[PDB]
Amino acid sequence: TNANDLRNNEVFFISPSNNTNKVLDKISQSEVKLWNKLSGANQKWRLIYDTNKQAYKIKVMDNTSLILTWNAPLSSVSVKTDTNGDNQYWYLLQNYISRNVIIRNYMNPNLVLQYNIDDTLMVSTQTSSSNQFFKFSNCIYEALNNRNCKLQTQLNSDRFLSKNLNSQIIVLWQWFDSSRQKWIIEYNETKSAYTLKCQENNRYLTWIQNSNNYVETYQSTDSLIQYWNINYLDNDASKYILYNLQDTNRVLDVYNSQIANGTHVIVDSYHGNTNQQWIINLI
Amino acid sequence: TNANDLRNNEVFFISPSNNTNKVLDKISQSEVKLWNKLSGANQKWRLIYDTNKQAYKIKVMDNTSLILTWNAPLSSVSVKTDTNGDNQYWYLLQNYISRNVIIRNYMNPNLVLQYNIDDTLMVSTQTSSSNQFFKFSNCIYEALNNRNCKLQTQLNSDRFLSKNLNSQIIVLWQWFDSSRQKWIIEYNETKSAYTLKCQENNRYLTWIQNSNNYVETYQSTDSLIQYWNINYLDNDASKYILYNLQDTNRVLDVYNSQIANGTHVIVDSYHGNTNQQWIINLI
């Protein structure tokens, strides 16, 4: 799968190549360490690419916004406030076949991240040891792919993405355990994005382009209007934003932030307010 | 596109990240320098991956079989006989976004390939400069994708891959500029392989599995029998072998090396002889 590719703005679990059950973990306001995987927000990291430097910042997703930092001139690493230091940027170069990634510091490319037997981390000169090889796993793909889910608008605890009765129009509706409110999320390798299939009619969440910009269940198509980049809110791993591939500047949105049953769900310009925030749970 | 991914056995043009028209070129029996792209075989390199070392050998495809070698302890590089030396292996790690690759030597990972102002290459300590960033361009994808082509057997001049008249069966036939002999070669991102579409009926070259093992033009399908790994011969970039994805151990083959018009083209076990060698040209 290409779901784990090192794309900008994606969130990952970073694990030692020798143990897929351990992950990079922010244990305190300054310390990082390899720890048993728990899928907690402090074990999730968003990549923010800097094109000018051709390097990335690695930001923890527990709401603190701290980023992986090399404590130059020491050999230790930590999570620290973002001050745009060269020591806070990292080259992420991957072996296409092994999928292993070397996390090389920007300030001093002779140093790479290394994990030790005692689960501690540090920077060191390169060797041929796998203790300098890491694997990246996209969090959302791991949690949501091929899962039957329900999507709740952050606007109201009991208003969910639902196909309307005797219509293809998708709207908000209170929960009543209906197949019209259950969606199978599936990653599409060709588009590198997700489709969401309504259990009631086996049709997909699709942006219908016209002045209304409503989303409706539609038959399978190769058109980008049916594909979505499901991501966590920039700094909140407990909520999601769904960007449409036809125009990634547009997202799944609740019309006029209304909560009444029947309110139209649409695709509109990203702003990030609660009417564009969704709570996704597995059925 | 994923057509340029660093897959084992694929062949590439290796160029500076900022100038794809300058490529690694074998200029003599032992020397390599950057040269303007001419698409000659001495400018094509096959990647040969070693799973234990998690590194690659880089072999020139002009039929000399020499591989890119670091002349340790000197900083120069050359092409030499493959003696499996550590200095002949290279870590190829890539930046997913920029697509740039750092060519790091296996014998001493502190050293990376670098091109100089005079087009010469050398191995030296890592910087943040683009003179150490390279791009890998899959030769075949560059030359054939979305191109209307004709394919002929190496067995005899003027014997082309041709859909039969009023039949779906594909055979050999003298050239008569027929739509039954023209094939649009298109890379399929989903399968990471090629399909070949006959101009006469818009149907694709497909392996029909039965005792005859004939290839026929068939309707579009997601079945692997319709996809092909088009690659150069093991040590010659002037002709090709077409491996079928349903069983990559089998290839497009001319029945018992017969050459008369009407000879059946089939899919059979790879041996690499002339009846499995194809010459592909643009229409």
- Nearest Cα neighbor of A109 from B156, B102, B197, B267 is B102
Whether the Cβ atoms of residue B183 and residue B282 lie closer than 8 Å to each other: no
DSSP code, position B128: S
The experimental resolution of this structure, in angstroms, equals 1.7
Method: X-ray
- The SS3 assignment for A166 reads coil
**Across the interface, do A125 and B102 touch by the CB < 8 Å criterion?**
no
Name residues 47-106 of chain B within 8 A of A (Cβ): 49, 51, 53-54, 91-98, 100, 102, 106
Helix (H) or strand (E) holding A240: strand A236-244
- Token pair for residue A24? 């990079």
User: Nearest residue on chain A to B51, judged by CA atoms?
Assistant: A98
Q: Which two tokens stand for residue A196?
A: 């969401």
Sequence-separated (6 or more) residues with CB below 8 Å from residue A150: A160, A161, A175, A181, A182, A183, A280, A281, A283
B213: left (phi over 0), alpha (psi -120 to 50) or beta: left
Query: What structural domains and CATH numbers belong to chain A?
Result: 1-138 (2.80.10.50), 139-283 (2.80.10.50)
Establish, for the pair of chains A and B, how many residue pairs have beta carbons separated by less than 8 Å. 64
Cα–Cα distance for residue pair B192/B201, rounded to 1 Å: 24
- For residue B120, count other CB atoms closer than 10 A to its CB: 14
> Could you give the CA distance from residue A184 to residue A204 in angstroms, rounded to a whole number?
9
Contact assessment for residue B49 and residue B56, using Cβ atoms and an 8 Å cutoff: yes
Which amino acid appears at position A75 of this protein?
S
For residue B84, the one-letter residue type is N
Determine the 3-state secondary structure of B254 from DSSP: strand
C-alpha–C-alpha distance, residues B68 and B126, integer Å? 19
In angstroms, rounded to a whole number, what is the distance separating the alpha carbons of residues B141 and B121? 26
* Alpha carbon of A10: minimum distance to chain B alpha carbons (Å): 12
Cβ burial, residue B180 (10 Å; 0-12/13-18/19+): buried
- Both tokens assigned to B283: 């229409």
- Cα–Cα distance between B260 and B163 in angstroms, integer? 15
Which residue among B8, B100, B106 places its CB closest to the CB of A97?
B8
